[PDB]
């Protein structure tokens, strides 16, 4: 059924040029126009435009003529969208769609900087002693100083749901990101679970894995 | 160029109320307008199509109202998984304007912080930094506030708090606050305090350790 897989994130450049693209499985791509969206941080999204593949219809919403140009390939599937003298300004999430009403994809996220990619450093969170304060203890990971967004963080290889929290990343004085993913387990259960915190920074291929 | 706009912006409202959003648009879509509930770093999901048609997997306490101009989504008895943006998109006559954005927190009542304060992590101090990490872990509203004591020095300035989206299922927040000092700042004092102040708490309480 309906799939739509986008590139993951890509940190460019300033004025220079990225190309996302969407890949879409389980239908027949040449009947639907793909459209496209950018959302910036805690914000509304605007549309771009729309590339039907097959009649090679394509319309932009007019402030994104220029700096966006839609274009697809009829045989993998594939619209792409390629934004054009990168800026800060550029810097947001951009999805694609389905139809008018359909299925969006996942999202891909633009940093657009200057600075350089820094996989992250994962520090452990244990507390000092038991007993601080219910029979609830908490253990996590500091993914500190890395750039670009976005870091994945996830417990005991995907097995541990119940309890965690992953905060959202922050900025840091150095403009490099920080987060930290805490557990809340009760005291009882010291020794019951080992807890391994995975880290995934997908921009620098940094793939960790802490035990607490 | 047709603008929608989206009233209101912010809903606070209990679990079981009755929630209406609308949204207008500048001139008239002939209900081609489609509802989408996005929640915290995801992909929007279908509501409702054609102004007034539910989408394949939405639940019956969703409903689309409107016509001309004037378009709504109503959830009736609301529940602890309706928080998230909600956003509407009119697809008559290109561009294809988005709304403002409606953000839902469901209410609850008082829950108050369970602390939490953790050392920093040698590795890390053999890194020439040390950051100490306070956890106020599942309370509601969200506004609580954290003060640092690093001896018994107020230290205001060098910390920084992120927080949770509310969770789906009991509707609390969680917060860290990472208080940052050199490796030197942080081995020239004993006691790291996070002290936490929420309406909820009776009388505030505050965590420490030592070195």
């Known amino acids: 059924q309906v799939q739509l897989q986008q590139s993951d994130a890509e940190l460019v450049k300033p004025g220079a040029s990225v190309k996302i693209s969407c890949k879409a499985s389980?239908?027949?791509?040449?009947?639907?126009?793909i459209h496209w969206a950018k959302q910036k941080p805690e914000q509304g999204l605007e549309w771009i435009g729309y590339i039907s593949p097959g009649n090679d219809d394509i319309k932009y919403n007019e402030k994104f003529k220029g700096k966006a140009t839609l274009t697809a390939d009829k045989s993998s599937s594939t619209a792409y969208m390629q934004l054009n003298s990168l800026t800060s300004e550029d810097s947001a999430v951009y999805f694609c769609?389905?139809?008018?009403?359909?299925?969006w994809g996942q999202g891909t996220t633009l940093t657009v900087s200057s600075a350089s990619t820094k996989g992250p450093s994962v520090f452990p969170l244990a507390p000092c002693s038991r007993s601080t304060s219910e029979s609830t203890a908490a253990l996590g990971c500091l993914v500190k100083d890395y750039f670009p967004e976005p870091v994945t963080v996830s417990w005991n290889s995907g097995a541990l749901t119940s309890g965690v929290h992953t905060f959202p990343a922050v900025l840091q004085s150095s403009g490099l990101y920080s987060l930290s993913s805490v557990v809340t387990v009760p005291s009882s259960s010291l020794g019951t679970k080992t807890y391994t915190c995975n880290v995934d920074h997908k921009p620098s291929n940094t793939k960790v894995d802490k035990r607490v | 160029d047709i603008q929608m706009t989206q009233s209101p912006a912010s809903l606070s409202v209990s679990v079981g109320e009755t929630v209406t959003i609308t949204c207008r648009a500048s001139?008239?879509?002939?209900?081609?307008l489609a509802w989408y509930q996005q929640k915290q770093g995801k992909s929007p999901q279908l509501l409702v199509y054609a102004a007034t048609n539910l989408a394949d997997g939405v639940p019956s306490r969703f409903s689309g109202s409107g016509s001309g101009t004037q378009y709504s989504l109503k959830i009736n008895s609301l529940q602890s998984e309706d928080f998230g943006s909600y956003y509407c998109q009119h697809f008559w006559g290109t561009p294809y304007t988005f709304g403002g954005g409606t953000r839902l927190e469901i209410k609850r009542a008082d829950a108050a912080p369970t602390v939490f304060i953790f050392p920093p992590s040698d590795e890390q101090l053999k890194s020439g930094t040390a950051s100490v990490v306070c956890l106020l872990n599942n309370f509601y509203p969200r506004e609580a506030k954290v003060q640092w004591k690093v001896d018994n020095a107020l230290q205001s300035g060098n910390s920084q708090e992120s927080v949770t989206e509310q969770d789906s299922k009991d509707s609390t927040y969680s917060l860290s606050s990472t208080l940052t000092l050199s490796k030197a700042d942080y081995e020239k004092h004993k006691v790291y305090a996070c002290e936490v102040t929420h309406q909820g708490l009776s009388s505030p309480v505050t965590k420490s350790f030592n070195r």
């Open positions: 389980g239908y027949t791509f040449t009947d639907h126009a």
């Open positions: 001139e008239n879509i002939y209900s081609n």
């Open positions: 769609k389905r139809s008018y009403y359909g299925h």
